[PDB]
Design a protein around this nucleic acid. Sequence first.
DNA 1: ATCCCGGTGCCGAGGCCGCTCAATTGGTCGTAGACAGCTCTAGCACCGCTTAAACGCACGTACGCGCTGTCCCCCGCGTTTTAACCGCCAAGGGGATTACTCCCTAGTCTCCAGGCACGTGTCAGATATATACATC
DNA 2: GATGTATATATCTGACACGTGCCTGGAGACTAGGGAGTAATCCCCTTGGCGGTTAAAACGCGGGGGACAGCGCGTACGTGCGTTTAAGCGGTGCTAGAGCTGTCTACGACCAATTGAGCGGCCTCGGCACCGGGAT
Lengths: 87, 80, 89, 91, 166, 107, 109, 93, 92
Amino acid sequence: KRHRKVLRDNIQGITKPAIRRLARRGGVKRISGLIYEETRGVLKVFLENVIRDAVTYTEHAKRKTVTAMDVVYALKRQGRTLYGFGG
Amino acid sequence: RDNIQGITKPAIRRLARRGGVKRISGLIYEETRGVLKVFLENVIRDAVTYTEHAKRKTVTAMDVVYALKRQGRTLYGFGG
Amino acid sequence: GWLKEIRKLQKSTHLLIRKLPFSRLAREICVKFTRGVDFNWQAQALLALQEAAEAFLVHLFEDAYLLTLHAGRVTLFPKDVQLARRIRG
Amino acid sequence: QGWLKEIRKLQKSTHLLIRKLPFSRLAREICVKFTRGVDFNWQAQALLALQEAAEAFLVHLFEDAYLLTLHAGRVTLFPKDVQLARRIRGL
Amino acid sequence: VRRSSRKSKAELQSEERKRIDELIESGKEEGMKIDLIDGKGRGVIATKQFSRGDFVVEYHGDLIEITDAKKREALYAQDPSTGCYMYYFQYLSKTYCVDATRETNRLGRLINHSKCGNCQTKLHDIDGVPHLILIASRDIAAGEELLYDYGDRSKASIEAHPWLKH
Amino acid sequence: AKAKTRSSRAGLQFPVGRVHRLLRKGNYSERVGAGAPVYLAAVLEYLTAEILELAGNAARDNKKTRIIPRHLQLAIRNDEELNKLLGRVTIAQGGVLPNIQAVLLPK
Amino acid sequence: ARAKAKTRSSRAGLQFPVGRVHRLLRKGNYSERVGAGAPVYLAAVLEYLTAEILELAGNAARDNKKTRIIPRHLQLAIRNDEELNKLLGRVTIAQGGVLPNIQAVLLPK
Amino acid sequence: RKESYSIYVYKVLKQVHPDTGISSKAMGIMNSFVNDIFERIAGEASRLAHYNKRSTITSREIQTAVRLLLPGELAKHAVSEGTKAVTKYTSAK
Amino acid sequence: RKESYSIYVYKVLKQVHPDTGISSKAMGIMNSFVNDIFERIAGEASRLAHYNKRSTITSREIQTAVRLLLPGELAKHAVSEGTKAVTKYTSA
DNA sequence: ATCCCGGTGCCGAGGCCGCTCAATTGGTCGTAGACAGCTCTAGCACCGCTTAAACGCACGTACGCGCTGTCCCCCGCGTTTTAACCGCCAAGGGGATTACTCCCTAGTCTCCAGGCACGTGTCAGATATATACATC
DNA sequence: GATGTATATATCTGACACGTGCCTGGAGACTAGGGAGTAATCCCCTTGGCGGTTAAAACGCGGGGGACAGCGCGTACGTGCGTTTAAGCGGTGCTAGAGCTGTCTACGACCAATTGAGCGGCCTCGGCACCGGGAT
């Protein structure tokens, strides 16, 4: 039984109704249809920054588990101070 | 009194023109004087706090440079 | 129909993107800043990263929709999210 | 033209666009509102640092509030645009 | 005389893209030999120190639209001796299909399916047309077999091929 | 002889001792005054009393008796001073203030 | 003090002062101790960044056909560069002017 | 053994709202808030000390660090409370 | 005895553009830039040392602070420069 | 649809007890910084004069804004389908702790050289006029 | 054909690049100690896998809500010009106040002793969530 071949992207896992719910929480009454790829791009950029700094804070501590304090300090460095994770 | 009116209309217009603005609603002048007064109130409150703490009476250049660095607007050219 | 959802979501506080797809996304981005070696993301750090990403995206959409109510629209186009960022920093 | 020569001329110079003495009097009037009725001397380069900062701020504010009024279809800067460019930045 | 060589990100991405394009249009296929594997059929062993993102192969084939894509797989599947050579991908609200059943001097169609393999497929669009690239997502040594994921979860297919889940 | 904590000498609830130790081992200065920990602890207790008062108010408005992250986000974003202070700060599990632009409501 | 001394900057091949950077790292209360390679690393980084900026500043000054780097040329170099502009984003450069940019929707037809 | 301001935030809570609890998540948020405000005030006081070529963080430096970091009415009231506590601490011996 | 970086920026200039001068205001601006980047890198190294319960600021801490503060290519090249300088310094 | 009301329930919070570590006390010293005093810088004030810039007015026309139409594209709905997720389990890596030792840095003192203020020659660039050309 | 702008020459002027005395800090050598690097251990807690479930995503479709282009009115902004005005510059003055310094005194670091507060494990119970019903 021949099967076809496809792939996934792990960014399309940030699904379309998830961006709809994020928008709606932000107050967005009516969302365009091209805001989804733009939002996945914005999210990937933000994550790239915060995760570069979390992974740096880890690699410096000679660890291999990106603790919650690594991410909290990465956000505190970017200026996104996050309360509630052992700061 | 009315020293904010000393920030003339053509001065705000030249600031805008530098910023790229092509036309300017005649109501942007009072808005810009309000915005400028708020910015100065913040920066001068921090400058005068840095002074009053240093037990001085002349707001130095470093007082204002540290006020700006505190608001997050680091200013290069006057020491640091 | 949209308003029974905006009121329903601005009143709740739970997370919006699912946990597992976001975990796979964060681990796919963490595997290119370590040059292909993977780090055991502590399961309480995926939550912190996700809470930060949701609060960021929600604030970004608040500002974007301040911009799409400015242009007279009600729709939130991509030329908005792209300008609520080019203004913000 | 006319506004276009003024723009090309001002975006290319590096002057201080607000007169020095009116801004001096304004900063000295705000320096009194705090520390009620005690005149702090002002180091003549503190007024320059303060004016450099206020002018870089206002020029960036108009440069950011003109992206909101080319975006809104206008060409004319409005007070709405400045208020929104400030309400987005976080001010 | 002391001059910085910093290679601005625009130039970095441009030179990376030109590198992928020239390595694709040259088809060196440096160090991959086809041999026999104990049960799965054939196998293409890689013999280079592969690492994160380094180029491996191109899944060369014939590119088509979706209306015929959803049909050609079933139409060629009527021959029970065709293996698996056609690849789907959704791109710009449009699906395509890499018709690669006919043997060509490329080594993309010569790979089998796994979920514990060593490579994963990406997309590269050399002047619009998307060529389906394959790069090593992890560190691979010289002497390992090419093995990537077909990503299709047809229920009848997973019933028929228990080695798809492997 | 019999001792009483510095938090009690100052009439605070926060620890003057732990604050002094944190000022010392934090490498903020080569020295630390005697009034510095007391002052900092008094300021911290005041800020926390403010935050917890506003959070208790926002909890009684919802007819609840526990303060939860959402209540802290309400107490913060609604007060002007604190929102200006905790401006860069995201409060996990804090939601957003219900604020739908009046342009959007059906006419 | 025999074996005539060569500055640590000279020993490392830098132009910035390893000695002064060490002294600033010490009397600045950044940490109780300070490594021996910390001043050398930090001074090498500072020299690299200053070379990166003075290179682009001189490029701009010779594009304007001048031979003195001025605040305007530093603002040009920094803001036109893609990464220095991100490192120095919050930073106002006194008498630096702004980048010439009239939005393309403004020009006459 | 990890330190935190849980018991003290709880005492202040029992001061302002006696009949009210605080969930463990809001407890962690108040711990992080107290830690962050402490780091802000103490860092600004360290900076105010080093700017004046002095070495001691005194109540002077903390009062000015508060007057810098906190907005208008928070600043005035926090400075009032700190001064009250310092005079109460040096009065009683 | 006023501290500055003027003569060292002069040296680096005469090393990059050997036939180019620098005005006094641009000298002050480069001075402020060096002071500011030094303050940033040192504060970040201090934060790292405090996070990992260490006591010494070392080349490890300074390298991590450089990698955190400078954007991509600047960070790569600055780390290269600093590593080269440290190896040369410990060799000599 | 959604809030007000009952009753279950459950799980997390609030209180209780034993240990331990760190907060308090007291005494000593050394050094930081408070203070008084002195010098001399530069900030404030004023005033005359120039004149650059602001200003007030008028006019036209560029543009903002409200209205209309049409075309297309979000949204809501219903059905299939899919993959997040929760529990359970198993493993095993690596985080966290601790003990040892060694080497790396602070402290000290002596030496000395480089860099900083200061005086000075000179030249890069900002005008000023003339020449030539771009442009609406 | 003004009206402005690109290009050269003359120049001169304040700012810059450079030589010098010296003095303050940078370098060397040595010692000691304690910070951290290394090794080993324990067990937490992260990863991986499976089954099943079901909540949620995906897809397609209709329709009607909204985006966008066009248009006409009218108003309010830009430009131009003669007038008024206030900034600016140069002087002097002067004097408050910043910067520096020497004394010394109070105040904070340090160190031994101790003891009690707080942190962790145990245990109970009720606040808030959930499932179902009546009212708005």
